[PDB]
Design a protein around this nucleic acid. Structure first.
Length: 436
RNA sequence: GGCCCGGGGCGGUUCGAUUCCGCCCUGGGCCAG
């Protein structure tokens, strides 16, 4: 039953003593190092508030800087500090560059920011993290394990991150929800009544109807914390809460096995579906996931849309990434359409336009039907693949700055066996609802 | 980089395009780190 299951679950989300101590001695050594240089800092993030999920230990140290400092000064002293304070350092880049490293074995993030009083005057998102901590540090005390269960849940089912690869619930959003509902269970029990029009103003301890799913930042009434959450993902969650409440289980907190299918079975299935299944392969632009994916979607979409307006009756799109390449997969209901198709002309009454409509020499001689003229034209392509090779070769520019640039220079369309050998059998099964 | 909203030019396609497919400049807003 519910309580039972949550009890054995705490064992998958709560970090064990050796993992907790390791983090401690790290926080310990790090505080020492920063103090021996006396820098004005503050630990924030799930580690600060002991809400981090077992296996995801990371300390996030924030360096407070005067309001007048020029951004550049913040990066330079920020880089300097991290340098002298870390065992190993490697510069990373978000809205502004920062340093990421390791101390006594654990991950550490060193982010520069402005020490400020009162939400406005914030220049970057980083400048808000400090507040979010101050606001969260007092109210979350005594619920960490709830935050954890809830993170483990979302993670287990692939919707925990808030980056563009997941488009799920950011950690902050998670804690914000525990603070509102009081515990994991109350959260799950209430999410079942969530709609795409639901608003959640933690600050006013209220819930209302809006024009989109909106969780208002306690610190900033205009910022939506769940801003990046995909409508579908929001759905999957509600549905996950309804199923969990109906039949609790520990399986909801255990990641689902990759479950890979032998290419031969997968070939039969597509044969059984009798659809056109092909992919568009091209070299992965060497860029960060936050830019790669929003592009892959655009790409997948433009092509999906080229496909349906072209009457190839697309059923689902999908994409995958690799160190090596990128695959835009598709499945159409039409392997081959006719060459002739009908075009709509003007109404018989409109002599002018009709005349011009007939000035176009065509191979088939247009006819009348229901008052207006029609014509028979010939397609430039007759299969989905044939068409996608056309759309891509000429519209690459509209498939995302980077993705589109790599497609322009090189890309190929795959299919058949040659396809179930590529590193994409998994997505294809998801795309096709393959089960068992 | 992506999304949203808005200006000024174009190209293609069409009997017919502000209205489909796209490209230039270009103003504001938002998202991820």
């Amino acid at each position: 039953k519910v309580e039972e299951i949550l009890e054995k679950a705490l064992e998958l989300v709560i970090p064990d003593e050796e993992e907790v101590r390791k983090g401690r001695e790290a926080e310990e050594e790090l505080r020492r190092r920063l103090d021996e240089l006396g820098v004005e800092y503050v630990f924030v993030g799930s580690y600060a508030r002991n809400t981090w999920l077992k296996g995801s230990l990371e300390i996030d140290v924030f360096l407070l800087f005067p309001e007048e400092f020029s951004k550049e000064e913040l990066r330079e002293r920020g880089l300097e500090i991290g340098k002298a304070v870390l065992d190993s350092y490697e510069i990373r880049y978000a809205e502004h560059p920062y340093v990421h490293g390791v101390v006594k074995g654990v991950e550490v993030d060193v982010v520069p920011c402005y020490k400020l009083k009162e939400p406005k005057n914030i220049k970057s998102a980083v400048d808000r993290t400090p507040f979010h901590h101050k606001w969260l540090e007092g109210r979350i005390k005594g619920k960490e394990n709830e935050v954890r269960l809830l993170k483990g849940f979302l993670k287990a089912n692939g919707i925990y991150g808030a980056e563009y690869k997941v488009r799920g619930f950011s950690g902050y959003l998670c804690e914000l929800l525990i603070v509102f509902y009081g515990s994991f269970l109350e959260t799950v029990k209430n999410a079942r009544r969530w709609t795409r029009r639901t608003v959640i103003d933690v600050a006013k301890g209220e819930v209302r109807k809006g024009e989109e799913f909106f969780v208002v930042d306690p610190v900033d009434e205009k910022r939506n914390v769940a801003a990046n959450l995909s409508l579908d993902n929001l759905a999957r969650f509600v549905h996950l809460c309804r199923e969990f409440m109906e039949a609790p289980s520990l399986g909801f907190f255990k990641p689902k096995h990759p479950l890979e299918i032998e290419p031969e079975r997968l070939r039969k299935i597509v044969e059984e579906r009798g659809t056109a299944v092909f992919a568009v392969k091209f070299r992965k632009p060497d860029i960060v996931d936050d830019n790669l994916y929003p592009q892959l979607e655009r790409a997948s979409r433009k092509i999906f849309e080229f496909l349906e307006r072209e009457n190839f009756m697309p059923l689902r799109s999908a994409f995958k990434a690799s160190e090596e390449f990128c695959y835009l997969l598709f499945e159409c209901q039409i392997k081959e359409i006719s060459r002739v198709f009908r075009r709509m002309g003007p109404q018989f009454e409109d002599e002018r336009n009709v005349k011009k409509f007939l000035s176009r020499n065509r191979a088939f001689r247009p006819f009348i039907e229901n008052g207006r003229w029609w014509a028979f034209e010939m397609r430039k392509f007759t299969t989905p693949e044939e068409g996608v090779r056309s759309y891509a070769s000429t519209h690459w520019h509209t498939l995302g700055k980077n993705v589109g640039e790599s497609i322009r220079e090189y890309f190929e369309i795959i299919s058949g066996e040659k396809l179930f050998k590529e590193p994409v059998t998994a997505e294809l099964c998801e795309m096709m609802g393959v089960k068992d």
